[PDB]
Amino acid sequence: PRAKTGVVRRRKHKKILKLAKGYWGLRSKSFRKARETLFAAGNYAYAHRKRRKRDFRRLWIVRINAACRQHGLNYSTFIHGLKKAGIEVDRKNLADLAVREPQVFAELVERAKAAQ
Amino acid sequence: MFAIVKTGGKQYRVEPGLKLRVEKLDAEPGATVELPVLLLGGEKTVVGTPVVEGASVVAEVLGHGRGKKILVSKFKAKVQYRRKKGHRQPYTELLIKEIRG
Amino acid sequence: MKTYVPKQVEPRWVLIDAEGKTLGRLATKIATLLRGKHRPDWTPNVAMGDFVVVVNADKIRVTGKKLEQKIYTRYSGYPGGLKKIPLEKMLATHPERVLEHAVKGMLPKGPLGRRLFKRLKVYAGPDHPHQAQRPEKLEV
Amino acid sequence: AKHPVPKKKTSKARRDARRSHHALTPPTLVPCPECKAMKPPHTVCPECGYYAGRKVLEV
Amino acid sequence: VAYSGRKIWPQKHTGRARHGDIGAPIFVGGGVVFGPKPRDYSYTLPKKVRKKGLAMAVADRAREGKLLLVEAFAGVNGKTKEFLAWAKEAGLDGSESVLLVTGNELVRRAARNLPWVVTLAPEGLNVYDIVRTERLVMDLDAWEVFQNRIG
Amino acid sequence: MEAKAIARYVRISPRKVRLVVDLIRGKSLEEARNILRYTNKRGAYFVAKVLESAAANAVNNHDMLEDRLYVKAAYVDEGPALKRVLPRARGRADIIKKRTSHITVILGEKHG
RNA sequence: CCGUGAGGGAAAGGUGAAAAGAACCCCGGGAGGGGAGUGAAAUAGAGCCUGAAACCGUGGGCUUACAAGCAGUCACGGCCCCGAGGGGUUGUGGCGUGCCUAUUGAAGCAUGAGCCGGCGACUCACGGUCGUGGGCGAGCUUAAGCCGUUGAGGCGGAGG
RNA sequence: GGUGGAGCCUGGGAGUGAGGGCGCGAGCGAUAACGUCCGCGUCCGAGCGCGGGAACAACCGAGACCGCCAGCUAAGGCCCC
RNA sequence: GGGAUGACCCCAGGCGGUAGGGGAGCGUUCCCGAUGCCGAUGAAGGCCGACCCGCGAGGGCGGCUGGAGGUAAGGGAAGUG
Numbered sequence A: 001p002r003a004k005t006g007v008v009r010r011r012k013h014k015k016i017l018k019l020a021k022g023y024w025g026l027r028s029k030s031f032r033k034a035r036e037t038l039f040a041a042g043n044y045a046y047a048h049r050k051r052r053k054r055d056f057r058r059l060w061i062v063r064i065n066a067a068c069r070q071h072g073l074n075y076s077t078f079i080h081g082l083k084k085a086g087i088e089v090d091r092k093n094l095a096d097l098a099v100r101e102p103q104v105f106a107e108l109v110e111r112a113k114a115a116q
Numbered sequence B: 001m002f003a004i005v006k007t008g009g010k011q012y013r014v015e016p017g018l019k020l021r022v023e024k025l026d027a028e029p030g031a032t033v034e035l036p037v038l039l040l041g042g043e044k045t046v047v048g049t050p051v052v053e054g055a056s057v058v059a060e061v062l063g064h065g066r067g068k069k070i071l072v073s074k075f076k077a078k079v080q081y082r083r084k085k086g087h088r089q090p091y092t093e094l095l096i097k098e099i100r101g
Numbered sequence C: 001m002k003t004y005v006p007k008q009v010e011p012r013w014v015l016i017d018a019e020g021k022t023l024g025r026l027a028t029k030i031a032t033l034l035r036g037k038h039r040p041d042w043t044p045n046v047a048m049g050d051f052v053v054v055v056n057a058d059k060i061r062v063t064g065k066k067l068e069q070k071i072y073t074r075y076s077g078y079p080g081g082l083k084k085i086p087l088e089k090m091l092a093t094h095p096e097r098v099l100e101h102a103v104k105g106m107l108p109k110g111p112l113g114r115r116l117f118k119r120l121k122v123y124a125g126p127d128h129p130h131q132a133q134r135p136e137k138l139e140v
Numbered sequence D: 001a002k003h004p005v006p007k008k009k010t011s012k013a014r015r016d017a018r019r020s021h022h023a024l025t026p027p028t029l030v031p032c033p034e035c036k037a038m039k040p041p042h043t044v045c046p047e048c049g050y051y052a053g054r055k056v057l058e059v
Numbered sequence E: 001v002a003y004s005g006r007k008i009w010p011q012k013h014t015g016r017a018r019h020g021d022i023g024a025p026i027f028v029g030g031g032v033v034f035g036p037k038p039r040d041y042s043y044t045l046p047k048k049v050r051k052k053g054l055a056m057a058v059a060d061r062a063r064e065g066k067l068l069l070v071e072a073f074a075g076v077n078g079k080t081k082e083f084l085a086w087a088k089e090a091g092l093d094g095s096e097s098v099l100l101v102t103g104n105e106l107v108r109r110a111a112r113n114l115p116w117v118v119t120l121a122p123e124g125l126n127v128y129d130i131v132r133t134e135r136l137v138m139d140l141d142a143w144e145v146f147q148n149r150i151g
Numbered sequence F: 001m002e003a004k005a006i007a008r009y010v011r012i013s014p015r016k017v018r019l020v021v022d023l024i025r026g027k028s029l030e031e032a033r034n035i036l037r038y039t040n041k042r043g044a045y046f047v048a049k050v051l052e053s054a055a056a057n058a059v060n061n062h063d064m065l066e067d068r069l070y071v072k073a074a075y076v077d078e079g080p081a082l083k084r085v086l087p088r089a090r091g092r093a094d095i096i097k098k099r100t101s102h103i104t105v106i107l108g109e110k111h112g
Numbered sequence G: 001c002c003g004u005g006a007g008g009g010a011a012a013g014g015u016g017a018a019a020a021g022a023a024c025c026c027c028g029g030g031a032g033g034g035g036a037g038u039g040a041a042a043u044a045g046a047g048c049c050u051g052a053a054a055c056c057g058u059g060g061g062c063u064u065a066c067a068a069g070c071a072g073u074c075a076c077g078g079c080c081c082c083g084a085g086g087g088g089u090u091g092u093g094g095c096g097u098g099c100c101u102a103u104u105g106a107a108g109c110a111u112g113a114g115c116c117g118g119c120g121a122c123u124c125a126c127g128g129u130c131g132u133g134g135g136c137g138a139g140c141u142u143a144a145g146c147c148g149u150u151g152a153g154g155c156g157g158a159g160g
Numbered sequence H: 001g002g003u004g005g006a007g008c009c010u011g012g013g014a015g016u017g018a019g020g021g022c023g024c025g026a027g028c029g030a031u032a033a034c035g036u037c038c039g040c041g042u043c044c045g046a047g048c049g050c051g052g053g054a055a056c057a058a059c060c061g062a063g064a065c066c067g068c069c070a071g072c073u074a075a076g077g078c079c080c081c
Numbered sequence I: 001g002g003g004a005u006g007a008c009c010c011c012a013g014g015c016g017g018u019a020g021g022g023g024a025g026c027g028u029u030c031c032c033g034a035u036g037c038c039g040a041u042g043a044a045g046g047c048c049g050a051c052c053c054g055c056g057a058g059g060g061c062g063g064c065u066g067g068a069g070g071u072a073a074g075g076g077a078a079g080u081g
């Protein structure tokens, strides 16, 4: 019994083109070029979702060092105090106290200058 | 009055009336749990070292589910090695009832 | 919980005298201000930094034989168009550009940092026409 | 000569962009003062054979 | 295939691919690679494996009680309707597919058109037809030869 | 309301007539006629004829006023191709595509 | 149709249940269309069943004329849509060297591919050798054939 | 001592039989070569996935199942990019 | 380890990877299942889907087109991607 391609090939090419919607030129209109693109973005994502956690921390850190320096010290000198002080609040939160609740943070700064 | 609790290996700022997705909890829905605390502030400021003895955050388990599907794809060139995976992240949606400290 | 994103903020204007100050070690503070990395609300993809009004830029100081041996250069696109310009003469010609060119290179590349240099305004002499801004002078 | 030939197909955008100058500037028309029919200035009106206020053509 | 064999165009310098006869399966309308041919799917299953599966088959229906025998068929003589009246009185309502297994021709001729009856000379009783069905009927005759085949 | 004409299988290259149609789109019927009439090209004979054939359909079949008529939508689609050969030098034959056009024109009533 | 000749060798199917295949009127030389009319359906109108993809065009929303680039991915923000959420879009900041092939090694200035759709490459028969699910087991098994059936199976011990 | 994707034995299926950089020991070479030919090892090959090295298969770090807007570290780094 | 056996639960550890070995599955054509079931209150196919289940290949649901065919649990055979 014969069994030609039939309905199978097309459909799969419509899987790849639906995920390729929004791509420039053929990349969204040509199948082959849609795969070659979906390949990269496939690795770019997981290569980048692994990075989001590093793009922020560095940010967060960048904001804390700014505040810390408003009180007469630097990000380096108060990470230690919070260590020595036994404080485990994280840079994400620390980065939000530094902006919205600037007088809580000031405390932490103080509890850091002393823990040393 | 606001609190920095720690659940799911991660720390969150919570307040009464806050729906929060956190890592799944072994907790029957509708039930209520207590969350460790690291810092209370707003009115009276208090800092944990690392936590605070009696203070705890009471939350209501609204339910459990599964976050949207992320497409984790692997691909090595000139080798014929692709991989495709569907990943939905378990998760718990809480309601922040009160801040008992 | 998500990270904080600051709505449009009215920038602040700073006034920095450079007389006596050392070149490269001044432009590092400016660019920082421009970047805004002195703000607790710093954000990478916006111009949330001061404007920097530098003055007496003709009196910047420098270490060693740089006036004689620091060679600002240009390439006129055509052959033989490599212009080699000593520091001594850039001052005795277009001094406000010794500092500019210095800070310019301390600002990121691409659009953003290209419109942050715009927020830099370095004038030679003790005066600036930005009086209408009431610049908050800084000491560094 | 060595038969120059394109190295790459020209994208849609790249051709359609090059055609930002293929717009037809519509013809300059004005009214004829004796029949009011539109026609190009400086020509003997094809609608009433008038030009310069006098007759010149059968139409 | 029914084409020639001339090398369609030279091996080199035509600027196009390499080809020979347009009967190659790489062509359209050309040859087919490993497509089917006549075959003898038949094959020689072991006897005991069939003389045994011919007794396992029945027994199964016997466990269910779906097996039924009869001395003779009272009053059938070659008319289907002469059968349902019988089958009715034998509890064969039609709600169950049946395998009628007898030598009596007239009988096999009466019910063979029946949408829920499989007829067979007991000399042809086979598993598939047994399993095909929900019940199973036989003459003690057809029953007898049956015995004398699994024995 | 709307009224349209469609000159199909027009043997003309679309990418040529559209230069004409692009020149009257959104114009008043009288202004198109005045344009299609002194537009020095070949697709004007066709774009015009379609304009008139559509103006008729509006006035005569859809109860529309030849005085409110502007060109609401006009748009030249392409049809089949007349593939004719062209013997070049040295035994090689090309294939020219004599192009056929689909010239549709939709009119409306700019009330007021 | 190609070849002087032997010889080579295509492409091309489908309206609808029934032509009831569009009278008549209108723009046009015509082609073609616009109403009328037929039909359950007319983007089933004969260039006709379904009508995908490349390819082309019209309208709309976002966006772009100091920018740089395997064109995408992550975060944020602005506008549009849908009714603590989602969809489309892209301004800025971060990151980022196509697919396949052959290679010690390619984004690779090494090969192949303009694009799309369909054909397109590890099979079959006999014999062999391991493994495996079963049947019988110092025993197992039949081959061509004969009968039966008309998708009924049984016989056949020669022989291996 | 060692319970490890350790080892012994029988049997089925392979692919490989064009390697390359580095380090140390030699020969050949000119105490040349991103040279060549052997030996122990390592890595790339197959890790052209990640960090450092401005950028770079093989130098330093480190063996990527998946997700997080959490924490600690290695090489390398902390005036600005 | 439970419990008894693949019922699901707990603890621990493994899971970069070309040539290549192995295992478990999806999907296409066809046969029994089928004198059956689905179908004009609309088959197969086609265009959308931000919803559902699946690691994934894929499977359902809904809306538009489409207008007469399609075919389940469980198995069999290939011109099977």
Ligand SMILES: NC(=[NH2+])NCCC[C@H](N)C(=O)O
Residues within 6 Å of the ligand: E108, E109, E112, E119, E120, E121
């Ligand atoms: N009387 C018989 N042996 N009948 C056997 C079946 C014959 C035929 N195949 C049928 O179904 O009618």
Ligand SMILES: [Mg+2]
Residues within 6 Å of the ligand: A004, A005
């Ligand atoms: Mg095929």
Ligand SMILES: [Mg+2]
Residues within 6 Å of the ligand: A005, A006, A007, A008, A009, A010, A011
């Ligand atoms: Mg297909």
Ligand SMILES: [Mg+2]
Residues within 6 Å of the ligand: A008, A009, A010, A012, I081
């Ligand atoms: Mg395919």
Ligand SMILES: [Mg+2]
Residues within 6 Å of the ligand: A008, A011, A012, A015
């Ligand atoms: Mg598919």
Ligand SMILES: [Mg+2]
Residues within 6 Å of the ligand: A038, A042, B073, B084
């Ligand atoms: Mg994919």
Ligand SMILES: [Mg+2]
Residues within 6 Å of the ligand: A046, A047, A048, A050, A051
């Ligand atoms: Mg990454």
Ligand SMILES: [Mg+2]
Residues within 6 Å of the ligand: A053, A054
């Ligand atoms: Mg990390």
Ligand SMILES: [Mg+2]
Residues within 6 Å of the ligand: A055, A059, C044, G094
């Ligand atoms: Mg950043």
Ligand SMILES: [Mg+2]
Residues within 6 Å of the ligand: A072, A073, A074
């Ligand atoms: Mg300091």
Ligand SMILES: [Mg+2]
Residues within 6 Å of the ligand: A083, A087, A088
């Ligand atoms: Mg800490």
Ligand SMILES: [Mg+2]
Residues within 6 Å of the ligand: A099, A100
């Ligand atoms: Mg605020």
Ligand SMILES: [Mg+2]
Residues within 6 Å of the ligand: B077
């Ligand atoms: Mg690559």
Ligand SMILES: [Mg+2]
Residues within 6 Å of the ligand: B077, B078, G099, G100
């Ligand atoms: Mg490749």
Ligand SMILES: [Mg+2]
Residues within 6 Å of the ligand: B077, B078, B079, B080, B081
């Ligand atoms: Mg490959």
Ligand SMILES: [Mg+2]
Residues within 6 Å of the ligand: B075, B076, B077, B078, B079, B080, B081, B082
């Ligand atoms: Mg690959």
